[PDB]
RNA sequence: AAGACGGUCGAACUUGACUAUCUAGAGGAAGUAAAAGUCGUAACAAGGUUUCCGUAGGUGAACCUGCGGAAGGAUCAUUA
RNA sequence: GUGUUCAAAGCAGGCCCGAGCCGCCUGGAUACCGCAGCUAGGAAUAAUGGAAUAGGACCGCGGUUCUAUUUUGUUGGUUUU
RNA sequence: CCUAUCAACUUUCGAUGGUAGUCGCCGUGCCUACCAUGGUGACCACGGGUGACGGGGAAUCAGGGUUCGAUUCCGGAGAGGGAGCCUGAGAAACGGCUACCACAUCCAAGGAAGGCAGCAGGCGCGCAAAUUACCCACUCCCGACCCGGGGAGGUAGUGACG
């Protein structure tokens, strides 16, 4: 499905993600959301997984796991 | 020696070898399939992944010198792990979040060197090889 | 699946003894159905334009069969992979030329001119023998030739001249002991020979010992012992490489003598 | 208790040679181990013997030569077809020129040369050189 | 032998029937009609149980109209328990060229036992024959029981 | 023809239960590596209390002790 | 077996005639089949066979009773064999 | 093929068998009445696991063995997942149909049409794998037919698997 992830810093983008939830199954797409007049990354992204499972286990896991210092919050699109 | 040796016996000696084969530390670990479970190799040969972060290593004696490692959490595998860059002054050409592609070392699954932890070396940076960037082959791209 | 039956054949799983190549095709031309069984068969085209090679296209092949200038057993055939089989006569109605299918003890089929003589009949061994419907008797033959009202004294494993002028049974030579054979399939692939002796099993497979003409003795199956006449008295001649059973050393110095000898 | 009989009776020709004894009491006594000694004997491997007769199962004193090198016995027998027979010559015998790889075939017990001639196999008993 | 009104349906056998004719009352058999008997070849005989039957199986071979066709095997009667079936267990030898000695396996066959059979016991040494699925399991029938030697009861003196 | 009676095959759905596989996690307690720091001196020569086994209890710790063993002990050897 | 220039391979080919010789001719062997099953020769090896308070052989024979069909033309009854 | 850190298992929604019937292209607990209480296991059943399709075959080994088999051929199986069906001798068919479920598409919002584990190609995936090409002339297949159609198949291009 589409899964939105939120708690970004401006030194986590795609490729930060991208390694950071393939073991929960293979991402087909990460769109982040960036806008270059005020900061980098917003703040909000929306991770594709191709299979409805490894979607769902990704909200799961990483929903309290830390990356960056931070309690990254994942949750259904 | 020590074995059955009848004339109806077949079935003992085909089943005693199989329990016994398990022993053996080589085939156990492959057989159970813990090799592709704990080390990244096994069930892959080479692996591509991104660059966490450069650390140096104040290397474990025997043996004084900075071995000077990288961090790759590999894409396919999903594992983190540390692995050696080799080649003379090559440390330099890693960049944090510009990929490397990974290859096991030479004693398979387990740590070589003076260096524990290690068991894994770099192959290619930026993909474009490391050992062309050492000899001068070919440029750094990135 | 498989939804049903298949209509194509792959060259190389064709049957060895019809004498195509390996992978330099990779179809086979296949039988047509009729009379007899896909394995033993030689479909039309490998024996005209790779035998007797009249034709270097399929496209040729067609436009032949259609001139109409082919009957086989005496009727006008036109189907481009007739499915041929054992003692069944070409006649070739341009040339006046009848060709017969027999083994050779090779094992390849035979390209074996005979007479028109030998063209009027041929000798097929009843397969069943059967009391039809409303009390006619009938004889039926290998070739899955049904003949009705037929000599009535006849038993299994009797020979039976059909004749293709006319059809119908034009007498026929009663089985016994020591009549001739020819052991087809198997080991004993195109050896002639006698009977001597057939040993009876009640149930299932019964074997027959035959002996050859060059005296080796060998058993088959009855069912791989066709009788193609009465004993010592051939109604078709025998077929090159002597069609009896030679050995590997005499048939390199028979290769090798008559080669750069011809000509 | 004896579950192979021939495997007794090489072994303590054997012993005895090793000492130059020229006797041994062997027991308790088979015709296959009558067949077996008379085959050895033929080819001078070990020189004649004499059977005991007692009521319990007999006795033999086999009186050897030191002209052997070894008896081995294949417990557990084995068949071989002819083309067993082979792997085995090349495996366990010195030489193809000499030594005799002894069978029990249905055409009696033999040794393995006239086996070949007839081309009857069977079961391995043992050999000798 | 035995009765086929013990059921609740009474049979016949194909082209055995009732003519009652002119003349009063039966048949109204005195064996139950005309009991036929036919051989199945292969070295068997039809025995006297076949003559003296009137049962309801007809899974038999002698009074059916099953065909007994393909392998004959022989077995060792491992179980009787309920009526109308046994259970064999069948020896065979499984080669092994891997080790140079070979190893014995078994399977246990459910196999029908007919009627045309008593006077059987467990430890009978049998001879069965291949036919079309009579039931599930059962693919075969009981052709003759055989007695033997290696079993005794043949030292008497009665 | 729609429709429709009753049945059979039966996708799917809903509510409880179940197991497997995967993953988050404050905290707790181990073993390993990890190295030249802190406190003892345990075993190694009878290591200055010979060692060690089973078992129970005790000692900050190595460890000690009772009870029965073993020698792989330091005893292959003690008597008219 | 065979002259793909060697070779990986392929199943081909080689001759005689000016081109009316309206042409001659060799081939694409043979070997292999987990097993089980089928056939057949052997009888060593390993198991296996029986007659004990008797049993097996040879129309050895009797008195008693039964049933099936040959036959006394045919068919029925009685009596045997 | 591996497993006992799987030792008892199979029927109340038949487990095995007898009998009789319904049903099916046809055998048969296939299904059902009635009636029996069976059937199977230490010779490993039962249960669990499996990048577990099977064979012909492949690689290395003195011999013995060990390892491999989706993959040019043969058999079976499936065509997004399930279930049902029509035509026809043969199909429970995705370049047929119908429903639902998961996916995707057009819409004027009422509706409507769909299945590349076909050939090319693209996306995703990864350490990993080619032309959106040309042709029915060959080789064969199909048809009412020599005549037509064929991503069967041939042909080139890509190609340091080797």
């Known amino acids: ?77 | 020696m020590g074995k059955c040796r009848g004339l109806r016996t077949a079935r003992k000696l085909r089943s005693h070898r199989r329990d016994q084969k398990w022993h053996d530390k080589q085939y156990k670990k492959a057989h159970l399939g813990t090799a592709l479970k704990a080390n990244p190799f096994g069930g892959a040969s080479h692996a591509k992944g991104i660059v966490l972060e450069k650390v140096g290593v104040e290397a474990k004696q025997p043996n004084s010198a900075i071995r000077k490692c990288v961090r790759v959490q590999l894409i396919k595998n999903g594992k983190k792990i540390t692995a050696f860059v080799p080649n003379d002054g090559c440390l330099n050409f890693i960049e944090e979040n510009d990929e490397v592609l990974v290859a096991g070392f030479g004693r398979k699954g387990h740590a070589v060197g003076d260096i524990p932890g290690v068991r894994f070396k770099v192959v290619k940076v930026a993909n474009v090889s490391l050992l062309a960037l050492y000899k001068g082959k070919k440029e750094r791209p990135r | 699946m498989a939804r049903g039956p298949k209509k194509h054949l792959k060259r190389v799983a064709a049957p060895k003894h019809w004498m195509l190549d390996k992978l330099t095709s990779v179809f086979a031309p296949r039988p047509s159905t009729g009379p007899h069984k896909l394995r033993e068969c030689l479909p039309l085209i490998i024996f005209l334009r790779n035998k007797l090679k009249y034709a270097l296209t399929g496209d040729e092949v067609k436009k032949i069969c259609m001139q109409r200038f082919i009957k086989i057993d005496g009727k006008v055939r036109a189907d481009i992979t007739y499915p041929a089989g054992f003692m069944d006569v070409i006649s070739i109605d341009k040339t006046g030329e009848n060709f017969r299918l027999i083994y050779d003890t090779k094992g390849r089929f035979a390209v074996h001119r005979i007479t028109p003589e030998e063209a009027k009949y041929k000798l097929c061994k009843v397969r069943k023998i059967f009391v039809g419907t409303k009390g006619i008797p009938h004889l039926v033959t290998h070739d899955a030739r049904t003949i009705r009202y037929p000599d009535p004294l006849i038993k299994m494993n009797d020979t039976i001249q059909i004749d293709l002028e006319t059809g119908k049974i034009t007498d026929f030579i009663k089985f016994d002991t020591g009549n001739l054979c020819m052991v087809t399939g198997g080991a004993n692939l195109g050896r002639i020979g006698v009977i001597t002796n057939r040993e009876r099993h009640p149930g299932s497979f019964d074997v027959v010992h035959v002996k050859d003409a060059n005296g080796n003795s060998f058993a088959t199956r009855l069912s791989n012992i066709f009788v193609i006449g009465k004993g010592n008295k051939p109604w078709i001649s025998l077929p090159r490489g002597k069609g009896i059973r030679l050995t590997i050393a005499e048939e390199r110095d028979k290769r090798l003598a008559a080669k750069q000898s011809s000509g | 208790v004896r579950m192979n009989v021939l495997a007794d009776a090489l072994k303590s020709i054997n012993n005895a040679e090793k000492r130059g004894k020229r006797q041994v009491l062997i027991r308790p006594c088979s015709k296959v181990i009558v067949r077996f000694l008379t085959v050895m004997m033929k080819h001078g491997y070990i020189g004649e013997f004499e059977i005991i007769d007692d009521h319990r199962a007999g006795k033999i004193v086999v009186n050897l030569t030191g002209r052997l090198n070894k008896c081995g016995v294949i417990s557990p027998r084995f068949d071989v077809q002819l083309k067993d027979l082979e792997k085995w010559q090349n495996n366990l015998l010195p030489s193809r020129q000499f030594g005799f790889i002894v069978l029990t075939t249905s055409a009696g017990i033999m040794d393995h040369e006239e086996a070949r001639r007839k081309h009857t196999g069977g079961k391995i008993l043992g050999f000798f050189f | 032998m035995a009765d086929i009104q013990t059921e609740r349906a009474y049979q016949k056998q194909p082209t055995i029937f009732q003519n009652k004719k002119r003349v009063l009352l039966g048949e109204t058999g005195k064996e139950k009609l005309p009991r036929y008997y036919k051989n199945i070849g292969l070295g068997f005989k039809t025995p006297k149980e076949a003559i003296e039957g009137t049962y309801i199986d007809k899974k038999c071979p002698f009074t059916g109209n099953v065909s007994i066709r393909g392998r004959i095997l022989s077995g060792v009667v491992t179980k009787m328990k309920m009526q109308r079936t046994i259970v064999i267990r069948r020896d065979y030898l499984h080669y092994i060229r891997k080790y140079n000695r070979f190893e014995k396996r078994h399977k246990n066959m459910s196999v029908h036992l007919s009627p045309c059979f008593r006077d059987v016991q467990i430890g009978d040494i049998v001879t069965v024959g291949e036919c079309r699925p009579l039931s599930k399991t059962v693919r075969f029938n009981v052709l003759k029981v055989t007695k033997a030697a290696g079993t005794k009861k043949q030292f008497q003196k009665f």
């Open chain 1, 1 to 77: 499905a589409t899964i939105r992830v939120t708690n970004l810093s401006e030194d986590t983008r795609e490729t930060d993600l991208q390694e950071l939830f393939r073991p929960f199954g293979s991402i087909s797409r990460i769109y982040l959301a960036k806008d270059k007049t005020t900061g980098q990354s917003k703040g909000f992204a929306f991770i594709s997984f191709h299979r409805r499972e490894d979607a769902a286990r990704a909200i799961a896991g990483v929903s309290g796991f830390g990356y960056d210092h931070l309690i990254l919050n994942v949750e259904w699109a």
